Ligand SMILES: *[C@@H]1O[C@H](CO)[C@@H](O)[C@H](O)[C@H]1NC(C)=O
Ligand SMILES: *[C@@H]1O[C@H](CO)[C@@H](O)[C@H](O)[C@H]1NC(C)=O
Ligand SMILES: *[C@@H]1O[C@H](CO)[C@@H](O)[C@H](O)[C@H]1NC(C)=O
Ligand SMILES: *[C@@H]1O[C@H](CO)[C@@H](O)[C@H](O)[C@H]1NC(C)=O
Ligand SMILES: *[C@@H]1O[C@H](CO)[C@@H](O)[C@H](O)[C@H]1NC(C)=O
């Protein structure tokens with residue numbers, strides 16, 4: 160500091176000393192409200208592809224990792240952001256889709272694809288940000304007589320557009336003459352499936368959740384779920400409480416907060432106190448000891 | 458309908474921060490001191506929030522309806538505090554003009570006539586409410602001080618935040634749902650609030666009323 164090799168007598172100022180932290184503490188609120196997609200993924204009956212249910216998912220915490228183990232999804236294709244980024248943006252008005260389609264058809268549910276189902280039944284846009292998931296359903300969507308309860312569109316005098324649904328049942332015209340009833344070139348534009356438990360792999364019914372989900376933006380942002388760790392006291396730690404981030408020592412306090420308050424502030428700005436979202440206890444935050452490291456030499 | 462004055466009523470907690478024995482100079486939407494208050498089923502405008510006071514004994518007040526046009530083409534907010542739990546429903550309800558029930562029964566919610574999308578739902582003596590709407594959030598603050606007497610008490614009461622909601626709709630006209638009340642309109646101002654040992658607001662001073670209440674600020 161003195162820029163010399165001959166230090167005279169005295170007390171010379173020098174660098175500063177700080178007590179660096181040693182642990183990291185993250186305490187997000189109790190994890191209470193989450194959606195039982197159990198109703199969305201573990202139902203007895205789903206809808207036909209021509210009348211696909213745009214299932215609404217809202218106001219809950221995203222916990223579908225159990226469906227990783229309970230339901231072995233053989234198909235999982237995400238054309239949008241990576242799942243690891245899903246914590247940065249959550250969804251409130253997000254849509255979900257429930258499909259019951261054939262086996263050699265999951266490849267047709269993809270952006271830029273063509274075919275009967277893609278053109279007449281369900282069309283995805285080129286810029287599709289979502290995940291397709293499918294799984295076999297022989298044990299609960301096939302019958303010896305035949306599951307004559309799932310339908311799909313075959314004829315239509317136009318092409319579809321992204322996110323369009325049609326329920327029309329009017330007969331389809333194929334010739335010049337005007338039409339009243341079936342008979343001649345006037346076909347009914349609805350045909351059902353014939354699922355049986357002993358079909359081949361390419362013809363067995365696949366329960367296909369085309370999670371064509373997005374609709375992230377909204378005044379509300381019900382979020383994915385956050386991990387919490389334990390709490391450490393009387394030690395220098397780096398803390399993150401509901402987005403308030405800092406460093407210091409968290410000791411027991413005796414301030415009497417009001418039931419609607421979260422933080423506390425001193426006479427200037429500093430976050431003197433805080434309230435833990437889970438155990439609901441006042442905790443005083445005191446900053447880490449720091450100062451000068453002055454040197455005395457003769 | 459008549460016109461009266463509000464002595465020092467309408468002061469609420471601006472934020473969820475605890476402060477102990479201090480004086481805070483803040484800027485926010487408030488009801489100016491000694492402003493003109495309408496004393497009262499007409500439709501009233503909604504300029505950057507409203508302050509609603511009610512005094513009754515027969516419990517004729519049952520809720521509120523909010524919207525921009527109430528034409529069943531834009532989302533409308535209905536709040537009904539029927540008897541035990543408050544219902545908040547946000548959609549294009551086709552409300553009737555005059556929802557009134559004789560007098561027991563406690564049924565027949567024929568206030569609306571049709572249903573629609575209906576995204577959001579929620580359940581849970583001188584009643585004072587502040588309704589504010591900002592940043593796509595609807596904030597409802599309330600206070601219930603049992604009146605000792607029958608006149609209007611010129612006194613100080615801070616309003617704790619009852620609920621904050623991400624309804625995310627637009628509102629320009631608000632009405633009242635029956636089975637005396639006071640309506641006031643908010644404005645941007647700067648206030649000085651006093652905090653006791655216990656993060657309670659005990660006194661407030663405006664900064665645009667009088668020469669004294671500018672030197673104080
Ligand atoms: C939520 O609070 C209860 C109350 O004691 C507690 O038992 C529970 O473990 C808390 N949940 C979390 C996420 O810690
Ligand atoms: C879809 O809706 C139909 C009725 O329109 C119902 O029978 C079926 O169970 C629903 N399926 C899903 C995916 O919830
Ligand atoms: C939900 O479905 C998964 C899929 O196989 C299954 O493992 C799990 O046991 C089901 N739970 C219930 C109770 O439906
Ligand atoms: C409303 O009250 C204010 C008091 O600040 C007064 O100046 C104004 O004239 C009143 N308006 C009326 C009585 O119409
Ligand atoms: C749902 O919303 C759409 C557009 O916002 C509207 O056309 C439709 O009528 C709504 N559903 C009902 C049942 O009103």
Ligand SMILES: *[C@@H]1O[C@H](CO)[C@@H](O)[C@H](O)[C@H]1NC(C)=O
Pocket residue numbers: 415653654655
């Ligand atoms: C704060 O709350 C305590 C609760 O016992 C009460 O005794 C006290 O008077 C309140 N106000 C002050 C000035 O501390």
